[PDB]
C-alpha cells in the first residue's frame, strides 16, 4: 500500500506537496523553557527547540534545560530521545542526560564539520589515552575501542559517575556518510546501519531511550527514527498494509518539531521502510545483501 502510494506520488511528482501538507498539520506546542533568556546559549539553532511537554529535564537544581525531546512511540513501544549536537558549553549536560536517562546507545548522524562549518562539538574522546572529564556534570568518558567501517564507526565508551564511581558502557554509532539536509546513499547502507544499532541492544526496552542526534536533531535523526518505528509496527502485526508512514511521522511531530526537513528525506523514509519490509516479512537473507551493497569494508 505504501508502495502503491509511493509510485502514485512519484508518478505525479507530488512529494513537495505531500511534504508541505505534513508541515501544515504538524502539531505546535509552546517552548517557553527553551526560549528563556538564561537558556539562550544552550540552543544551537534559534528555530529548533524542544516542546515543553516532552523535553528531557536535567536532574540538577540549577538549570534543568537541554535542547532534547523524548519521542515516545506508544503503539510501537519504543522511545527515542532526539537532541541537537552538543555545543562547547553543553557537553556536560549531554552526558548527564545520557546517564540519568539510562541510555545504552547514542546515534550520531553527522560529521563534526559539514559543508565547511562546525556542526557539532567534539563531545567524545578520540584516543584511548586521552579520556574526558566534564567538570560541570562530574562525569568521565573514556574511549575503550572503535570499529571503523567505510561509511560508519562504532565506538565503545565508558561513562563514569565521578560522584558514585559507577560506570556504564555506551555504544556510539556514527554515520559519516549522510550529507547535511541530504539523504543516505542507498536505503541499503542506511538499513545496514539501523540494524547494527538494533543488534547492539541499544534500542531494547531494558535500556533507557536511545539518544539520536544530528546537527539540530530533527532532520536526519527524524528519518532514522521514522524508519525504525515503521518497521517495528509492521513487525508487530506482520501486516505491511496497516502502516501509515505519514500518520506515524505526525505522531512523532507531536513530541518534537520539524522531524524530517526535506521532501526528499520523506521520500527516502518511504524507500528504507519499503526495502526493510523484505527482511521484516520473512526474507532474512536481505540483511546480508545490504551489508554487501553498503560496502562497509575499507
Ligand atoms: C522543514 O521545517 C519543518 O518541518 C518545521 C515546521 O513545519 C514547523 C516548525 C519548525 C520546523 O523546522 C525548523 C528547523 C530549523 C532548522 C534550522 C537549521 C538547521 F540546520 C536544521 C537542520 C539540520 C538538520 C540535519 O543535520 O540534517 N536537520 O535540521 C533545521
Tab-separated table of C-alpha atoms and ligand atoms in Angstrom:
chain	number	residue	atom	x	y	z
A	1	UNK	CA	0.000	0.000	0.000
A	2	UNK	CA	2.823	2.349	0.828
A	3	UNK	CA	4.384	1.086	-2.377
A	4	UNK	CA	1.247	1.999	-4.320
A	5	UNK	CA	1.196	5.422	-2.715
A	6	UNK	CA	4.929	5.683	-3.419
A	7	UNK	CA	4.618	5.055	-7.177
A	8	UNK	CA	1.478	7.187	-7.033
A	9	UNK	CA	3.409	10.121	-5.541
A	10	UNK	CA	6.428	9.549	-7.788
A	11	UNK	CA	4.291	9.115	-10.909
A	12	UNK	CA	2.889	12.619	-10.417
A	13	UNK	CA	5.920	14.249	-8.779
A	14	UNK	CA	3.993	15.415	-5.731
A	15	UNK	CA	6.444	14.887	-2.858
A	16	UNK	CA	6.954	18.617	-2.284
A	17	UNK	CA	3.189	18.852	-1.867
A	18	UNK	CA	2.813	15.751	0.319
A	19	UNK	CA	5.648	17.133	2.419
A	20	UNK	CA	4.248	20.628	2.816
A	21	UNK	CA	0.935	19.006	3.792
A	22	UNK	CA	2.550	17.204	6.706
A	23	UNK	CA	4.058	20.539	7.718
A	24	UNK	CA	0.625	22.125	7.623
A	25	UNK	CA	-0.784	19.516	10.007
A	26	UNK	CA	2.245	19.158	12.277
A	27	UNK	CA	1.482	19.824	15.937
A	28	UNK	CA	2.595	23.093	17.505
A	29	UNK	CA	3.344	23.360	21.221
A	30	UNK	CA	4.937	26.027	23.443
A	31	UNK	CA	8.693	26.083	24.036
A	32	UNK	CA	8.783	28.557	26.911
A	33	UNK	CA	11.664	26.985	28.838
A	34	UNK	CA	13.892	26.762	25.766
A	35	UNK	CA	13.149	30.380	24.933
A	36	UNK	CA	14.028	31.722	28.389
A	37	UNK	CA	16.872	34.267	28.252
A	38	UNK	CA	19.019	32.130	30.542
A	39	UNK	CA	18.961	29.248	28.066
A	40	UNK	CA	19.831	31.336	25.017
A	41	UNK	CA	23.309	29.845	24.876
A	42	UNK	CA	22.068	26.288	25.365
A	43	UNK	CA	20.449	26.225	21.940
A	44	UNK	CA	22.369	25.722	18.680
A	45	UNK	CA	19.540	26.929	16.435
A	46	UNK	CA	17.066	29.725	17.108
A	47	UNK	CA	14.437	27.776	15.136
A	48	UNK	CA	14.962	24.408	16.791
A	49	UNK	CA	13.579	23.910	20.275
A	50	UNK	CA	12.045	21.156	22.398
A	51	UNK	CA	8.360	21.436	23.265
A	52	UNK	CA	7.822	22.000	26.959
A	53	UNK	CA	5.584	18.927	27.358
A	54	UNK	CA	8.206	16.493	26.059
A	55	UNK	CA	11.603	17.976	26.873
A	56	UNK	CA	14.171	15.931	28.781
A	57	UNK	CA	14.841	17.698	32.091
A	58	UNK	CA	18.353	17.508	33.550
A	59	UNK	CA	18.366	16.289	37.163
A	60	UNK	CA	20.163	19.341	38.559
A	61	UNK	CA	18.622	22.138	40.632
A	62	UNK	CA	20.478	24.927	38.866
A	63	UNK	CA	19.123	24.880	35.313
A	64	UNK	CA	17.383	21.700	34.143
A	65	UNK	CA	17.351	22.708	30.463
A	66	UNK	CA	18.807	20.936	27.439
A	67	UNK	CA	17.660	21.009	23.845
A	68	UNK	CA	16.292	17.441	23.794
A	69	UNK	CA	12.887	15.809	23.287
A	70	UNK	CA	11.650	12.378	24.285
A	71	UNK	CA	9.803	10.925	21.296
A	72	UNK	CA	7.659	8.252	22.972
A	73	UNK	CA	6.052	5.923	20.408
A	74	UNK	CA	3.249	4.336	22.391
A	75	UNK	CA	1.832	1.876	19.854
A	76	UNK	CA	5.292	0.631	18.829
A	77	UNK	CA	6.650	0.524	22.404
A	78	UNK	CA	9.886	2.288	21.545
A	79	UNK	CA	11.302	5.572	22.802
A	80	UNK	CA	13.960	7.831	21.353
A	81	UNK	CA	15.458	10.958	22.862
A	82	UNK	CA	16.288	13.265	19.931
A	83	UNK	CA	18.725	16.076	20.632
A	84	UNK	CA	20.872	18.762	18.966
A	85	UNK	CA	24.598	18.342	18.548
A	86	UNK	CA	26.247	19.375	21.853
A	87	UNK	CA	27.654	22.879	21.965
A	88	UNK	CA	31.064	23.604	23.553
A	89	UNK	CA	29.209	24.516	26.769
A	90	UNK	CA	26.587	21.747	26.771
A	91	UNK	CA	28.709	18.581	26.521
A	92	UNK	CA	28.457	18.002	30.256
A	93	UNK	CA	24.683	18.411	30.023
A	94	UNK	CA	24.613	15.909	27.135
A	95	UNK	CA	26.349	13.169	29.114
A	96	UNK	CA	24.335	13.996	32.221
A	97	UNK	CA	21.209	13.292	30.159
A	98	UNK	CA	22.585	10.015	28.800
A	99	UNK	CA	23.427	8.902	32.299
A	100	UNK	CA	20.207	9.974	34.035
A	101	UNK	CA	18.021	8.634	31.224
A	102	UNK	CA	19.941	5.347	31.365
A	103	UNK	CA	20.751	5.342	27.672
A	104	UNK	CA	22.799	2.498	26.237
A	105	UNK	CA	23.331	3.878	22.755
A	106	UNK	CA	23.981	7.243	21.076
A	107	UNK	CA	23.368	7.629	17.338
A	108	UNK	CA	25.330	10.402	15.615
A	109	UNK	CA	24.167	11.048	12.053
A	110	UNK	CA	26.532	13.879	11.137
A	111	UNK	CA	30.231	14.601	10.949
A	112	UNK	CA	31.708	17.278	13.202
A	113	UNK	CA	32.324	19.523	10.201
A	114	UNK	CA	29.934	19.645	7.253
A	115	UNK	CA	29.917	21.994	4.267
A	116	UNK	CA	32.905	23.717	5.868
A	117	UNK	CA	31.176	24.601	9.121
A	118	UNK	CA	31.283	23.313	12.706
A	119	UNK	CA	28.053	21.356	13.039
A	120	UNK	CA	28.734	19.815	16.446
A	121	UNK	CA	31.215	19.809	19.304
A	122	UNK	CA	33.780	17.046	19.692
A	123	UNK	CA	31.876	15.661	22.672
A	124	UNK	CA	33.506	12.192	22.859
A	125	UNK	CA	37.189	11.148	23.237
A	126	UNK	CA	39.109	10.189	20.111
A	127	UNK	CA	42.119	8.486	21.669
A	128	UNK	CA	42.079	5.868	24.413
A	129	UNK	CA	44.877	7.558	26.365
A	130	UNK	CA	43.045	10.876	26.376
A	131	UNK	CA	39.828	10.473	28.328
A	132	UNK	CA	37.476	13.385	29.005
A	133	UNK	CA	36.219	14.780	32.305
A	134	UNK	CA	33.160	17.010	32.324
A	135	UNK	CA	33.694	19.136	35.404
A	136	UNK	CA	30.253	20.710	35.466
A	137	UNK	CA	28.305	17.399	35.464
A	138	UNK	CA	31.053	15.488	37.268
A	139	UNK	CA	31.354	12.729	34.674
A	140	UNK	CA	34.228	10.967	32.948
A	141	UNK	CA	34.083	9.482	29.458
A	142	UNK	CA	36.744	7.123	28.134
A	143	UNK	CA	37.225	5.659	24.680
A	144	UNK	CA	37.510	1.891	25.069
A	145	UNK	CA	37.715	0.964	21.381
A	146	UNK	CA	36.282	1.715	17.963
A	147	UNK	CA	35.370	-0.352	14.901
A	148	UNK	CA	35.779	1.870	11.848
A	149	UNK	CA	33.886	0.823	8.715
A	150	UNK	CA	33.793	2.609	5.343
A	151	UNK	CA	30.759	4.823	5.990
A	152	UNK	CA	30.131	4.460	9.760
A	153	UNK	CA	32.060	3.798	13.008
A	154	UNK	CA	31.002	2.056	16.216
A	155	UNK	CA	32.711	3.234	19.406
A	156	UNK	CA	32.618	1.633	22.799
A	157	UNK	CA	32.764	4.274	25.510
A	158	UNK	CA	32.787	4.033	29.279
A	159	UNK	CA	30.820	6.666	31.139
A	160	UNK	CA	31.603	7.084	34.826
A	161	UNK	CA	29.691	8.957	37.500
A	162	UNK	CA	32.545	10.568	39.453
A	163	UNK	CA	30.142	11.085	42.356
A	164	UNK	CA	29.452	7.377	42.810
A	165	UNK	CA	32.270	5.831	40.763
A	166	UNK	CA	29.589	3.953	38.828
A	167	UNK	CA	30.365	3.030	35.196
A	168	UNK	CA	28.396	2.294	32.012
A	169	UNK	CA	29.267	1.013	28.561
A	170	UNK	CA	27.930	3.442	25.978
A	171	UNK	CA	27.859	2.394	22.324
A	172	UNK	CA	28.451	5.219	19.845
A	173	UNK	CA	27.047	4.691	16.336
A	174	UNK	CA	28.454	7.302	13.960
A	175	UNK	CA	27.111	7.582	10.396
A	176	UNK	CA	29.778	9.502	8.489
A	177	UNK	CA	28.270	9.498	5.006
A	178	UNK	CA	24.892	11.227	5.346
A	179	UNK	CA	25.008	14.633	3.615
A	180	UNK	CA	23.611	17.583	5.629
A	181	UNK	CA	19.929	18.101	4.755
A	182	UNK	CA	20.644	15.204	2.405
A	183	UNK	CA	19.667	11.509	2.217
A	184	UNK	CA	21.694	8.288	2.613
A	185	UNK	CA	23.482	6.923	-0.441
A	186	UNK	CA	21.101	3.986	-0.750
A	187	UNK	CA	18.457	2.557	1.518
A	188	UNK	CA	20.763	-0.475	1.756
A	189	UNK	CA	23.538	1.336	3.614
A	190	UNK	CA	21.111	3.171	5.864
A	191	UNK	CA	19.307	-0.057	6.764
A	192	UNK	CA	22.552	-1.924	7.346
A	193	UNK	CA	23.328	0.810	9.879
A	194	UNK	CA	19.912	0.787	11.511
A	195	UNK	CA	20.122	-2.940	12.113
A	196	UNK	CA	23.622	-2.638	13.515
A	197	UNK	CA	22.210	-0.302	16.157
A	198	UNK	CA	19.314	-2.704	16.656
A	199	UNK	CA	21.598	-5.682	17.194
A	200	UNK	CA	23.543	-3.832	19.902
A	201	UNK	CA	20.536	-3.972	22.222
A	202	UNK	CA	20.761	-0.195	22.308
A	203	UNK	CA	17.163	0.065	21.109
A	204	UNK	CA	15.831	-2.599	23.520
A	205	UNK	CA	13.272	-1.652	26.250
A	206	UNK	CA	15.536	-2.953	29.007
A	207	UNK	CA	17.516	0.248	28.443
A	208	UNK	CA	16.773	3.955	28.654
A	209	UNK	CA	15.807	5.632	25.357
A	210	UNK	CA	18.494	5.678	22.673
A	211	UNK	CA	19.808	9.240	22.158
A	212	UNK	CA	19.739	10.137	18.442
A	213	UNK	CA	21.122	13.374	17.006
A	214	UNK	CA	22.419	15.265	14.004
A	215	UNK	CA	23.188	18.972	13.947
A	216	UNK	CA	19.729	20.083	15.068
A	217	UNK	CA	18.331	16.645	15.889
A	218	UNK	CA	15.280	16.739	13.660
A	219	UNK	CA	16.109	16.035	10.022
A	220	UNK	CA	18.387	13.037	9.657
A	221	UNK	CA	17.526	11.924	13.223
A	222	UNK	CA	13.864	12.019	12.259
A	223	UNK	CA	14.423	9.912	9.168
A	224	UNK	CA	16.233	7.306	11.298
A	225	UNK	CA	13.514	7.016	13.983
A	226	UNK	CA	10.686	7.080	11.455
A	227	UNK	CA	12.043	4.051	9.590
A	228	UNK	CA	12.716	2.261	12.859
A	229	UNK	CA	9.184	2.784	14.181
A	230	UNK	CA	7.505	1.949	10.870
A	231	UNK	CA	9.496	-1.273	10.539
A	232	UNK	CA	8.720	-2.032	14.172
A	233	UNK	CA	4.934	-1.621	13.832
A	234	UNK	CA	4.922	-3.552	10.582
A	235	UNK	CA	6.754	-6.256	12.526
A	236	UNK	CA	4.322	-6.281	15.452
A	237	UNK	CA	1.446	-7.424	13.265
A	238	UNK	CA	3.249	-8.770	10.183
A	239	UNK	CA	0.951	-6.524	8.162
A	240	UNK	CA	2.827	-4.011	5.968
A	241	UNK	CA	-0.538	-2.641	4.791
A	242	UNK	CA	-1.592	-1.220	8.157
A	243	UNK	CA	1.461	1.054	8.445
A	244	UNK	CA	0.639	4.662	7.584
A	245	UNK	CA	4.053	6.295	7.451
A	246	UNK	CA	2.712	9.869	7.312
A	247	UNK	CA	0.373	9.159	10.204
A	248	UNK	CA	3.432	7.819	12.067
A	249	UNK	CA	5.562	10.877	11.224
A	250	UNK	CA	2.805	13.146	12.515
A	251	UNK	CA	2.604	11.152	15.732
A	252	UNK	CA	6.310	11.826	16.191
A	253	UNK	CA	5.929	15.521	15.382
A	254	UNK	CA	3.807	15.866	18.490
A	255	UNK	CA	6.964	15.248	20.524
A	256	UNK	CA	9.496	17.315	18.571
A	257	UNK	CA	9.137	19.949	15.844
A	258	UNK	CA	10.073	19.550	12.201
A	259	UNK	CA	11.146	15.910	12.163
A	260	UNK	CA	12.258	15.258	8.561
A	261	UNK	CA	13.394	18.545	6.998
A	262	UNK	CA	13.014	17.909	3.251
A	263	UNK	CA	10.542	16.161	0.997
A	264	UNK	CA	13.416	14.034	-0.251
A	265	UNK	CA	14.170	12.743	3.235
A	266	UNK	CA	10.469	11.836	3.394
A	267	UNK	CA	10.849	10.006	0.081
A	268	UNK	CA	13.915	8.221	1.371
A	269	UNK	CA	11.991	7.312	4.523
A	270	UNK	CA	9.466	5.505	2.324
A	271	UNK	CA	12.264	3.730	0.474
A	272	UNK	CA	14.025	2.496	3.626
A	273	UNK	CA	10.747	1.167	5.046
A	274	UNK	CA	9.602	-0.496	1.802
A	275	UNK	CA	13.049	-2.081	1.459
A	276	UNK	CA	13.201	-3.053	5.131
A	277	UNK	CA	9.865	-4.839	4.889
A	278	UNK	CA	11.633	-7.505	2.819
A	279	UNK	CA	13.509	-8.506	5.966
A	280	UNK	CA	10.609	-7.994	8.379
A	281	UNK	CA	8.332	-10.210	6.268
A	282	UNK	CA	10.489	-13.353	6.315
A	283	UNK	CA	13.398	-12.853	3.911
A	284	UNK	CA	16.237	-12.916	6.424
A	285	UNK	CA	18.811	-13.087	3.599
A	286	UNK	CA	18.270	-9.449	2.546
A	287	UNK	CA	20.259	-8.323	5.587
A	288	UNK	CA	23.442	-9.762	4.048
A	289	UNK	CA	22.645	-8.167	0.696
A	290	UNK	CA	22.519	-4.806	2.431
A	291	UNK	CA	25.834	-5.457	4.157
A	292	UNK	CA	27.275	-6.156	0.683
A	293	UNK	CA	25.714	-3.258	-1.222
A	294	UNK	CA	26.783	-0.978	1.653
A	295	UNK	CA	30.467	-1.796	1.059
A	296	UNK	CA	31.400	-1.286	4.711
A	297	UNK	CA	34.903	-2.674	4.175
A	298	UNK	CA	37.828	-0.229	3.931
B	1	LIG	C1	11.097	21.866	7.389
B	1	LIG	O1	10.633	22.613	8.535
B	1	LIG	C2	9.821	21.998	9.413
B	1	LIG	O2	9.454	20.844	9.293
B	1	LIG	C3	9.379	22.823	10.579
B	1	LIG	C4	7.967	23.053	10.758
B	1	LIG	O3	6.995	22.546	9.901
B	1	LIG	C5	7.498	23.826	11.854
B	1	LIG	C6	8.400	24.388	12.787
B	1	LIG	C7	9.796	24.179	12.633
B	1	LIG	C8	10.326	23.401	11.534
B	1	LIG	O4	11.735	23.176	11.356
B	1	LIG	C9	12.639	24.103	11.942
B	1	LIG	C10	14.046	23.678	11.621
B	1	LIG	C11	15.089	24.551	11.508
B	1	LIG	C12	16.497	24.176	11.184
B	1	LIG	C13	17.477	25.200	11.106
B	1	LIG	C14	18.825	24.887	10.808
B	1	LIG	C15	19.187	23.534	10.583
B	1	LIG	F1	20.475	23.285	10.307
B	1	LIG	C16	18.222	22.479	10.649
B	1	LIG	C17	18.511	21.023	10.427
B	1	LIG	C18	19.699	20.457	10.116
B	1	LIG	C19	19.447	19.023	10.018
B	1	LIG	C20	20.498	17.971	9.684
B	1	LIG	O5	21.564	17.963	10.286
B	1	LIG	O6	20.151	17.079	8.700
B	1	LIG	N1	18.128	18.822	10.277
B	1	LIG	O7	17.515	20.067	10.536
B	1	LIG	C21	16.882	22.831	10.954
